[PDB]
């Protein structure tokens, strides 16, 4: 006959929530006081004869790292000086000495080191953060924008925002999978799949309407959406030819430190020379080619419509224009010059504007003040992809259009994380056998059970301790993995199969569970498929095995009672 038989280490998995952890490569935020050194090389492994599926949209990694970025940001900002006292009347005039409403000059009373010593003090501001004190007289009167809403903070000058190419690593007993196919829509089946231990260095970058740096799609232009039919759902398009772009602030600036309190110093802005609003440069000649290619790709999905782009539909500043950071300076460039039915063969330049008070995310409690940076500044970068949103009304003219959008920071990281995916491991397999009792991690999954059984020891040994505001996470991870492993070991022990991997036992196989051709089961089948039906009778099997062990032990003792 056949007999229930256990195997430990079978290569099967199941998706589930988890908590990855950071991995980095001398004062930056993330690397300092966080993140372990990255693995120099990916221990990538190819798994043929393995088909799978992915759902990039409904994913946990993106969301998981969302609040992680938020928390690291806030914590880094925690120790810096609060600018509370500055919410004082602002007697202001027009800037310059040789009306340029882009910036206003101001002066105001304020507090010295000594409580009862008050001094006047001036500073220049961009018109954005300033507001009229009220709809009242004294037009010179103004107040900072946030004050009637909430306070803000002057970031610690030393810290910087240069996005480090962070890596993510999973905890033991879990595996990270990549769909090799370079034309995956982002939601669907995949056939060429590999597995790695840590995610490739991804920079925590932030932008609207643009995907600065990142990566191209070497194959072609890529389009993906949860459902392009549903106009509301966002669309993301990735380029396969990165487009250079530059921006700069053509001004010579420097900061005046003001001891607002005893040990707390604000950094007012000031200028040396004349004032010229920041701007950008881009080779629209380059732009047109990718535009036309993506237009053809869109037509492919819409064989009876035209294609065009207009400026942002209108709304909050950051959404309307393209916002981003440049070496820790916030820029907002009006993008009407790009999304148009016509460009030139010449370089294109854009007028941008600069804000000093920033609502990094909609909740205002985290309102930040950007300290001025000395001297002019310039950032060069490139575009790899962009976010688009469809109009949503079927014009009789069929002039289908899309507009820039964004604002959902999760989508930015999604744009890359779509590749990855996370699963756990359940190395306890059960199968019938005639017996009766008395590295390339997970690679063998590419074969059948009887054949694949040889290398179970690799999976067994690897899955334990390969790893070696923040601590809590990794501590939870390690403890939980250890608990799981101990549970499995103990279950093996109770079944009397400790110190074994192909332990035979004394419970005959039951027909009801299944009646497949054993030859196929051992040579034509794979565990990922074998487990599916067996799942049903798992608990019955466990009870039978436990009873077998109990009766064996008790009978042994009885016969050896004397």
């Amino acid at each position, epitope marked *: 006959n056949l007999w229930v038989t256990v195997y430990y280490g079978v290569p099967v998995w199941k998706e589930a929530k988890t908590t990855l952890f950071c991995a980095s490569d001398v004062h930056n935020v993330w690397a300092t006081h966080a993140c372990v050194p990255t693995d120099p090389n990916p221990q990538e492994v190819v798994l043929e004869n393995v088909t799978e599926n992915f759902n990039m949209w409904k994913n946990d990694m993106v969301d998981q790292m969302q609040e992680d970025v938020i928390s690291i940001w806030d914590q880094s900002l925690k120790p810096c000086v609060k600018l509370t006292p500055l919410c004082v009347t602002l007697h202001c005039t027009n800037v310059t000495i040789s009306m340029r409403e882009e910036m206003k000059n101001c002066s105001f009373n304020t507090t010295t080191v000594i409580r009862d010593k008050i001094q006047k003090e001036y500073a220049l501001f961009y018109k954005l953060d300033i507001v009229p004190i009220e709809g009242k007289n004294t037009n010179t009167g103004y107040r900072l924008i946030n004050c009637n809403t909430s306070t803000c903070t002057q970031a610690c000058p030393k810290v910087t925002f240069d996005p480090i190419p962070i890596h993510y690593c999973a905890p033991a007993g879990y595996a990270i999978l990549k769909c090799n196919n370079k034309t995956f829509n982002g939601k669907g089946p995949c056939n060429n799949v590999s597995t790695v231990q840590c995610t490739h260095g991804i920079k925590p970058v932030v932008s609207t309407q643009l995907l600065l740096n990142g990566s191209l799609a070497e194959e072609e232009i890529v389009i993906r959406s949860k459902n392009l039919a*549903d*106009n*509301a759902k966002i669309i993301i398009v990735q380029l396969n030819k990165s487009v250079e772009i530059v921006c700069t602030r053509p001004n010579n600036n420097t900061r005046r430190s003001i001891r607002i309190g005893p040990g707390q110093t604000f950094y007012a802005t000031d200028i040396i020379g004349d004032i010229r609003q920041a701007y950008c440069n881009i080779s629209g000649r380059n732009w047109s080619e990718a535009v036309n290619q993506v237009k053809k790709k869109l037509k492919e999905h819409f064989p009876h419509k035209n294609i065009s782009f207009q400026s942002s*539909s*209108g709304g909050d500043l950051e959404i309307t224009t393209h916002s981003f950071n440049c070496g820790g300076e916030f820029f907002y460039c009006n993008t009407s010059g790009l999304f148009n039915d016509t460009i030139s063969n010449a370089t294109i330049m854009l007028p941008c504007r600069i804000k000093q008070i920033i609502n990094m995310w909609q909740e205002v409690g985290k309102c930040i003040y950007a300290p001025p940076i000395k001297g002019n500044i310039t950032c060069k970068s490139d575009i790899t992809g962009l976010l688009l949103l469809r*109009d949503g009304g079927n014009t009789a003219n069929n002039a289908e259009i899309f507009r820039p959008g964004g604002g959902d920071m999760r989508d930015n990281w999604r744009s890359e994380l779509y590749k990855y995916k996370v699963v756990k491991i359940e190395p306890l397999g059960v199968a019938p056998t005639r017996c009766k009792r008395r590295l390339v991690f997970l690679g063998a999954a590419g074969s059948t059970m009887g054949a694949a059984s040889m290398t179970l020891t690799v999976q067994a040994r690897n899955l334990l301790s390969g790893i070696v505001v923040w601590g809590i996470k990794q501590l939870q991870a390690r403890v939980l993995a250890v608990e799981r492993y101990l549970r499995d070991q103990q279950l093996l022990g109770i079944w009397g199969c400790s110190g074994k991997l192909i332990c035979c036992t004394n419970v005959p196989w039951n027909s009801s569970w299944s009646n497949r051709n054993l030859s196929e089961i051992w040579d034509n089948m794979t565990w990922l498929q074998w487990d599916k039906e067996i799942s049903n009778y798992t608990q019955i099997i466990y009870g039978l095995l436990e009873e077998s062990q109990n009766q064996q032990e008790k009978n042994e003792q009885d016969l050896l009672a004397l």
Partner: antibody
Amino acid sequence: VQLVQSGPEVKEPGASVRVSCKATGYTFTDHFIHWVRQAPGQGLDWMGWINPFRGGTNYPQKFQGRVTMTRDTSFTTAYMELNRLRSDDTAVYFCARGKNSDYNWDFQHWGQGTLVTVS
Amino acid sequence: VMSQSPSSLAVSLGERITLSCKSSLTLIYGENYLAWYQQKPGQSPKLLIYSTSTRESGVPDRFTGSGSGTDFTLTISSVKAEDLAVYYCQQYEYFGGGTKLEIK
């Protein structure tokens, strides 16, 4: 969760009319808010949505350049504004919200509905 | 355009009736769905069917929805007095021609 509007409106041709939509009972910044205009004896037609999260919007080409949508987080209230009035405008308007974020295409909750007319 | 025909019918109470919503999208891609909304004259419309045949909570089951792909149907086993009202189908921004039911 309740949806409220302001009183009906009457205005001369060629002007612009504003209407309000007050919401309550849940996170005002988690669900697209849709607008639908119904003239007497006509089918419900879509005018556009606004996402409270960051003031993003959208409109069909029929109304583009004629509509304006805005939000106030303080009072969790949406504002619509239609310019260059003309008889067609005269009709009822309903602001509605969707049961689930994922589908974001149903309408469980509806304001009482508000009528506007020209002249 | 999504079509709801006929515009009405000389119904009588207590009869099983079924009206057809025929779509026109038939393009790109889960799978497309439908929404049967109720509305009596002078009040806010109401949700009756969502998805394709999952009727809304609290609705008498005689109200029903069915169909696939392009052909869908609102259905009633036995029309009651209060049930005489107007109804529409909605897959996306667009809406059907609707239908209202009454007597001679």
